[PDB]
Design a protein around this ligand. Structure first.
Ligand code: SF4
Ligand code: SF4
Ligand code: FES
Lengths: 230, 56
């Protein structure tokens, strides 16, 4: 009754009619590596890291936006998939600066995590490596856009949730800059949160700056004041 | 060794034949230092078009 049997590696699971592929794999413990998808943000086909093979199907389908009909069998570790992930990771790492020493997210940034635990171990493509003019935005958000993977998260957040609608993309091909075209200050309530959503070191915290580093710090549960929302 | 006469006869006469590689290792055979600068090979993989990280 409004449930669907769909196999995962031959292991059946009952899911709702219209839950996504990525969710269906979440249910049994598969977390398909991803970038542009986010729990609070509407779906987009940008990152392409979510690719996964379904047997009997010639092309690889993107797990973010693909709805699940009955009887899909989702092979996560099938060779075609792993080759797809290695590919996507390679093209992403094609144009990226080497900032990991200076970059603020070095202990965190998902390009390093998913880079080791999925993508290939050795790069290629010598002559290359485009660069981007960096753009100052707020006093809160330090901005180096060379590290941007252009994953559209910041846009979709600013639009839907923040509601400011002042961020976008301008360009084609290699050259697409993500940010205000007129060099306007972007500041709002909830705006600072964007530095958590940027998966790479493109956006970061200006005041927190260079002081710390993720593995060195001891996380501690707490509550908030200054707002009655608790 | 250093110039030795009749004492090296004493040593030839006590412990037997010697004088190959005086125990002190002090005579040449020091290799100089790196006449060529080293250049190293790189083994399997390190090559485009052959491989995907899954197989290896
Ligand atoms: S954005 Fe990620 S991969 Fe790029 S320099 Fe920073 S930590 Fe390294
Ligand atoms: S600035 Fe960050 S969040 Fe925005 S598209 Fe680039 S990588 Fe994604
Ligand atoms: S989640 Fe499917 S494209 Fe990024």
């Amino acid at each position: 009754s409004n449930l669907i049997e769909v196999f995962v590696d031959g292991q059946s699971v009952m899911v709702e009619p219209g839950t996504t592929v990525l969710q269906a794999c979440e249910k049994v413990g598969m977390q398909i590596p991803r970038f542009c998808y986010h729990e609070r943000l509407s779906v987009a086909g940008n990152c392409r890291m979510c690719l996964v093979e379904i047997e009997k199907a010639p092309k690889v389908v993107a797990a973010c936006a693909m709805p699940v009909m009955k009887g899909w069998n989702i092979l996560t570790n099938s060779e075609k998939t792993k080759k797809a992930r290695e590919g996507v990771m390679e093209f992403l790492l094609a144009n990226h600066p080497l900032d990991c020493p200076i970059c603020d997210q070095g202990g965190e940034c998902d390009l390093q995590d998913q880079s080791m635990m999925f993508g290939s171990d050795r790069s290629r493509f010598l002559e290359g490596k485009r660069a981007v003019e960096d753009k100052n935005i707020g006093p809160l958000v330090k901005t180096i856009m060379t590290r941007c993977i252009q994953c559209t998260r910041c846009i979709r957040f600013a639009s839907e949730i923040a509601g400011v609608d002042d961020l976008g993309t301008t360009g084609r091909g290699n050259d697409m800059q993500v940010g205000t075209y007129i060099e306007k200050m972007f500041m709002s309530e909830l705006s600072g949160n964007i530095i958590d959503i940027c998966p790479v070191g493109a956006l970061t915290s200006k005041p927190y700056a260079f002081t710390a580093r993720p593995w060195e710090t001891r996380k501690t549960e707490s509550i908030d004041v200054m707002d009655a929302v608790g | 060794a250093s110039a030795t006469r009749l004492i090296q006869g004493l040593r030839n006469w006590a412990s037997g034949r010697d004088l190959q590689a005086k125990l002190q290792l002090r005579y040449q055979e020091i290799s100089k230092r790196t006449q060529p600068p080293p250049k190293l090979p790189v083994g399997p993989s390190h090559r485009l078009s052959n491989n995907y990280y899954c197989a290896r």
